[PDB]
Amino acid sequence: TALVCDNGSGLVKAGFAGDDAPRAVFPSIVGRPRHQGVMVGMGQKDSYVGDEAQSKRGILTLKYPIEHGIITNWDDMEKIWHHTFYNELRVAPEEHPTLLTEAPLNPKANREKMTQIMFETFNVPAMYVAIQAVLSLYASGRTTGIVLDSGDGVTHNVPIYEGYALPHAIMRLDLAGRDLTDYLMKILTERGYSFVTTAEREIVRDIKEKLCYVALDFENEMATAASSSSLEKSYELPDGQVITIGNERFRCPETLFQPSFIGMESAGIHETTYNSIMKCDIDIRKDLYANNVMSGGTTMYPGIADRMQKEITALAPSTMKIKIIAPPERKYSVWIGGSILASLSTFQQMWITKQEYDEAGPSIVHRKCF
Amino acid sequence: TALVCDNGSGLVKAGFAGDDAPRAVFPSIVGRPRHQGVMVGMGQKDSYVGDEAQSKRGILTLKYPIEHGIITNWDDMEKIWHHTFYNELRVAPEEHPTLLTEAPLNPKANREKMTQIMFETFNVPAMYVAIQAVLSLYASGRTTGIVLDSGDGVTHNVPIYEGYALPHAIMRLDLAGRDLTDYLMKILTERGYSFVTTAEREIVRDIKEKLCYVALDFENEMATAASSSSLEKSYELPDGQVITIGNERFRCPETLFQPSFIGMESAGIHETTYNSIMKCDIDIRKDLYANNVMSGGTTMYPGIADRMQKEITALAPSTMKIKIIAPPERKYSVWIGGSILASLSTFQQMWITKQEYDEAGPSIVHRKCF
Amino acid sequence: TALVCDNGSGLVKAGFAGDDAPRAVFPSIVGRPRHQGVMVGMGQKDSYVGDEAQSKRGILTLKYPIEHGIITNWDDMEKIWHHTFYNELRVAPEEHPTLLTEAPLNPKANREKMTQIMFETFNVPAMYVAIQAVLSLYASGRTTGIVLDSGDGVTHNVPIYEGYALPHAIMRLDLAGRDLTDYLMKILTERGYSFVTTAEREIVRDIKEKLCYVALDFENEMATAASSSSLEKSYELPDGQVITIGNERFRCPETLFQPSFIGMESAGIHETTYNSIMKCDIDIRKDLYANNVMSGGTTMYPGIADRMQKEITALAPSTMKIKIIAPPERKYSVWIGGSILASLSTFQQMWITKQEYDEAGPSIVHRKCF
Amino acid sequence: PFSGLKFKQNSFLSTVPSVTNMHSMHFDARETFLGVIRKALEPDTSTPFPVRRAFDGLRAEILPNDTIKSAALKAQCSDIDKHPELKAKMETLKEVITHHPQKEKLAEIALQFAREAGLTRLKGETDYVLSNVLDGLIGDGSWRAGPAYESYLNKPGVDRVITTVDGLHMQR
Amino acid sequence: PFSGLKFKQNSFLSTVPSVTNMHSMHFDARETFLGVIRKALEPDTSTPFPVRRAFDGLRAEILPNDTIKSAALKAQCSDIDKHPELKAKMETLKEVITHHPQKEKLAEIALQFAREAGLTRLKGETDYVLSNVLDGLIGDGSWRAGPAYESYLNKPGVDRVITTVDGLHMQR
Ligand SMILES: Nc1ncnc2c1ncn2[C@@H]1O[C@H](COP(=O)(O)OP(=O)(O)O)[C@@H](O)[C@H]1O
Numbered sequence A, B, C: 001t002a003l004v005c006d007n008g009s010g011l012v013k014a015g016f017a018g019d020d021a022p023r024a025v026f027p028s029i030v031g032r033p034r035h036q037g038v039m040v041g042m043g044q045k046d047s048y049v050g051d052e053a054q055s056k057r058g059i060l061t062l063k064y065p066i067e068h069g070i071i072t073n074w075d076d077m078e079k080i081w082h083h084t085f086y087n088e089l090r091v092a093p094e095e096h097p098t099l100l101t102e103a104p105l106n107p108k109a110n111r112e113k114m115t116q117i118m119f120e121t122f123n124v125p126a127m128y129v130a131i132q133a134v135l136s137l138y139a140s141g142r143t144t145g146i147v148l149d150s151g152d153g154v155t156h157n158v159p160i161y162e163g164y165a166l167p168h169a170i171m172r173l174d175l176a177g178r179d180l181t182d183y184l185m186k187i188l189t190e191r192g193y194s195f196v197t198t199a200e201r202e203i204v205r206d207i208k209e210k211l212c213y214v215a216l217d218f219e220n221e222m223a224t225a226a227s228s229s230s231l232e233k234s235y236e237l238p239d240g241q242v243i244t245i246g247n248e249r250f251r252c253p254e255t256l257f258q259p260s261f262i263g264m265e266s267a268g269i270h271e272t273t274y275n276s277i278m279k280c281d282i283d284i285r286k287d288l289y290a291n292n293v294m295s296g297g298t299t300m301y302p303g304i305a306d307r308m309q310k311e312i313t314a315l316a317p318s319t320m321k322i323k324i325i326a327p328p329e330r331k332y333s334v335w336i337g338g339s340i341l342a343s344l345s346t347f348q349q350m351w352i353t354k355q356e357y358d359e360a361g362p363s364i365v366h367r368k369c370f
Numbered sequence D, E: 001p002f003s004g005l006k007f008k009q010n011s012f013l014s015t016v017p018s019v020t021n022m023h024s025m026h027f028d029a030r031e032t033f034l035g036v037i038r039k040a041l042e043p044d045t046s047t048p049f050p051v052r053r054a055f056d057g058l059r060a061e062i063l064p065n066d067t068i069k070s071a072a073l074k075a076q077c078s079d080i081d082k083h084p085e086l087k088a089k090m091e092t093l094k095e096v097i098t099h100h101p102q103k104e105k106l107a108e109i110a111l112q113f114a115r116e117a118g119l120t121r122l123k124g125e126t127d128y129v130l131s132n133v134l135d136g137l138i139g140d141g142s143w144r145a146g147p148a149y150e151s152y153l154n155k156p157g158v159d160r161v162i163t164t165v166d167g168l169h170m171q172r
């Protein structure tokens, strides 16, 4: 059976094709010790990966090998793939075809080097690099729709109709979960909670996931926070200290719809989706309006689907039927689609094989992969 | 003396009739501050026009009031025209009749509004709205020929024979420099370069104008770029970073001949020119073949004329003599023609006057102007 | 006339708008008597503020009401402000608008309580809270520049282009004086000198201001200190004992460029300034690479400007012209800017008045001040 | 009054300033917001020409581009009791606004302007033209009670938590 | 050999460990430093692919990220005379290092590794690979005897301190 590794800016989702869920979901991090040790027999490992890095983060400097969907540290990404194959899946990668995923409009070198590492360093019999939005539509089971994929690094729209992608209508926005984490760190300083430094980004990410939500009406929510104090919620740090967060619960995700508040000129995710649909042929827009598929962790905010429905409705003509599809498992939909795709009989001829690789080199990935 | 204002999508070319070149050539942009505050006395000016907006680019959001030869923001277009009259030409418009231009097959409200503003806002004594391809033919000295005009917003060709236009043979493609600019920043992401802001779009436009060229044979140029580094050119960004581009140099202009690059179904400019000629009477085609005249910035790519010569020669019968006329003053041919037209003694009776406007209103423009 | 800027962690700087320097500095200190009281005449007051708290440091427990830019003791702070008005400026605060300062990204309660004390317990007619880096740029005569302010509790970067701040590019490190001072007394221990809390911390601070300097090349300076005696210098304690200090006097401010000396994970002040740039628009960075404005007491180390010049010249494209602006009155630039700002006629509408305060309450400060 | 008047939807979204610029210490909230509403009230070209000319006169008079004209109208409306024509024009335009197909989005923009740029800081003393526009968008007039604000100090749930860096230079 | 080889500016800065960690009991200075150099020598994607593929292979052989290969190369370099190709390849790699656009920062990092982590503790007996890399960064080779460590025992200025350093002992 084939392996499906959805690398992701923030998480590795890895598993075997045909399964309904990935076996291993761990942070896409490599941590290096900051301090002096200092005992004999302690700290002979120079680095920690994944869950081990997260557990020991107190004395580690954490670094994401992938940023904005682009692998920026290939040495540390090789560690994460070795950890995925050998420690998490416990498979010999020489035996399994490996399906990888990446965002659209990535640098071409990103997928060439992915191919090279898989064939040369890990010696996989074959591999494939798929587009995450296409995998998400596979997971949904639709053949039509515009996927809004928002993970930790990248938010991208891919409109698909009858199985045909309209690549000129693909929108990419380098504003995703990690950007929201940084903004939450910034607005948490308005109260006394000055993380202000790289130690606790991982824990304010947890505050973000636990407490943040999307306000259906931003002005109403702001007035409610200013007046009532019923929106206040508390969070307990690992130290046991309790922080209270009020309107920051919905101001942090509001950045998705107002890329300002972080100095970005781009339109919000609602208007990007609408712009994507309006770049499509007039005759497919109605089916796109009714098949807005959301995937990725950054679409897991409470109320984001309802906010998207209201926002796209306000942009589209009134006779159109806007429908947001937000499966409960949309956090793994990209991996689910990869599992579906990799297990299809018709896909078995699409794999890039080792023979084709060493005959053509890494540039083979551009021919055989979208 | 009469003012000539070639109000293109990208640039304003304005000046006085009878001069050989426009006096004021500045971007057709209004920029507004998108950042905050924060010093007393340093923000009272909202909105910047033209060159000043381009210089303060880094703190502004830039917006073109004209898109695809159509004025979409009439408040900003008034600012552009007020800047042209009072700040760039330093004239009182009520003392000067004004000749301005537009692309053929524009919405008719576009002429009516620009007539309204000129008579009611600027109190111009008289005005006229000419077709840009006709003005280009004036500038070429000819009275026969098929002009291919391609600027920032739209590319159109107008076949003229012995001074007679064949309007049923006018062609329009909403594919011009701005579409090529957008495509280049799309394919620049392949090399890891991300340009997303309006300012960065301006710098990408600068890269296009300096480094892009039309390949005589696209496939051979792709093979050359793939096999060697001979076609790579470097470019220094305003912050000192240096980007290098290879086949993007000619893949961007290739969109003119292969509009499917940006998802358009339309035929290339070569095929559009041939289709325009074939829509003409069989008797005039021979003269049109020999008098293909280029105008506009988008025809300033190196090798564009040679490529057009080759492409049209492949479509026409072998016994025809295809000649592309590409004056070095291509970029201003439209303004030059309008300067010629407005100074001809036989044109002084074709002006729309304030009195005719009063009697008839804005619709006088449809009767008096082609 | 108006009273002008200060909220300094280490020093108060009070004076009148329009003057070229503060009329009274005195340290931001409140000392409480310890281990005394037997004699009837040896001090009746339970606390001493600023000057004469330094004099009595031997019998007092000195503590700063402001730590890392945030005022944490509102009882002692009101004493310092009361001392500032009545004992140093010899003025009645109820008849002078008062301009105060704040580091960016401070807790918002800090500003709200500052404006509350001014209006309620000092009954000022009007007030204002400015950002210290903005005032530094005012003092420098620039409308453009990235100002690296660093006092006794906070070092922060504010990039401003044309009076427009880019708030998303504000950087703040809680690493300034009072961490170099605390590191220095840790580092003096290995030489043989202890310097336990408070009064001896003030002593250590005094020796830092006199003997510390930034090595242009740290490794070479360390080698020189190891192989020579030329870098050794001596300092005389209040009780007459003389201490000799060698490499400790450039390792102490080396913490600014290598914060891991004190266990911090953040990047050095050179990298943080560079990171503040590169978050600004690419079209602004060249102007910011020049106009690198120094401010605050912690920028007064000899050779810090030249080391920042060197460090930022690295990390930057070689074509960029790095220029560090370090005026001799660095230490008072913030106050100088406040005096300039509070004197401008155009600023006289920007004051928050008692009228606005009692209509809106403390929160008015947020919608009136950057 | 105006039948067959249509607007291009979303035409005004490009005109909305960034929230950060709304905080500028010299941001002209009244002129910028009136500019947004003016752009939103631009008749669609599909509107019949006699209606377009008719309404364009109304919005050009009430929402002129020129600052001199806008300041002239601002003064004349300060004593609106002596300008029954302006009363009628403003009432006609308020009726157009309240029927605008995208009034809900316009209200959100008006609320953002008040929240962020201090558009309605004058509360009940907001000038006549601006008040009618805000009344057209906000029918009940609740905007006259200025935006509710957070008031961070003395909050029940805020205490001095010490983070990894705050602990390095703590004090007591 | 490698015409047009280009590197990403500052790519290696995140690879530099904390100075505190450099003092760790089981800190492996050599592998950590060669990792920094390996990251610094990662070719920029601007580099043409045929050049990129050629140098990528060179640094794979001489600066492998795999620990098993690094040790195997180290043992294989004990008899560097018996590997003419390896001697020449490190000569080619050494030439690339000395032409690195950020050689000054790499050497400054190399010196920090020496002073803090004892990278050059073996002085002249340093491994062939590590020594030739250090030579590339520091041409004169002074690093073999440059790590001048300060000494505190028996140096001038040492004396007892009391009173204003607490420890009051006026009974002596
Ligand atoms: N329940 C949740 N609510 C809000 N955000 C979430 C939630 N779960 C995950 N996220 C965010 O989604 C991101 C991870 O999403 P994921 O789809 O794994 O992205 P990637 O594919 O890049 O790993 C994280 O930055 C995290 O903060």
Ligand SMILES: Nc1ncnc2c1ncn2[C@@H]1O[C@H](COP(=O)(O)OP(=O)(O)O)[C@@H](O)[C@H]1O
Residues within 6 Å of the ligand: B007, B008, B009, B010, B011, B012, B150, B151, B152, B153, B176, B177, B178, B181, B205, B208, B209, B210, B212, B295, B296, B297, B298, B299, B300, B301, B302, B331
């Ligand atoms: N030397 C050049 N090479 C390629 N393209 C150019 C050159 N100069 C201008 N252009 C393109 O032409 C456009 C402007 O042409 P112009 O005739 O001024 O159009 P308009 O009349 O609409 O202003 C710009 O979008 C620019 O990208």
Ligand SMILES: Nc1ncnc2c1ncn2[C@@H]1O[C@H](COP(=O)(O)OP(=O)(O)O)[C@@H](O)[C@H]1O
Residues within 6 Å of the ligand: C007, C008, C009, C010, C011, C012, C150, C151, C152, C153, C154, C177, C178, C205, C208, C209, C210, C212, C295, C296, C297, C298, C300, C301, C331
């Ligand atoms: N020449 C100097 N050398 C070293 N440190 C200095 C020097 N002058 C002032 N300082 C330090 O700078 C700090 C004062 O800077 P300042 O801008 O007043 O900070 P604040 O605004 O917090 O009072 C003090 O802690 C002082 O020790």
Ligand SMILES: [Mg+2]
Residues within 6 Å of the ligand: A008, A009, A132, A150, A151, A152, A296, A297, A334
């Ligand atoms: Mg994902």
Ligand SMILES: [Mg+2]
Residues within 6 Å of the ligand: B008, B132, B150, B151, B152, B296, B297, B334
């Ligand atoms: Mg033109």
Ligand SMILES: [Mg+2]
Residues within 6 Å of the ligand: C008, C009, C132, C150, C151, C152, C296, C297, C334
């Ligand atoms: Mg200060």
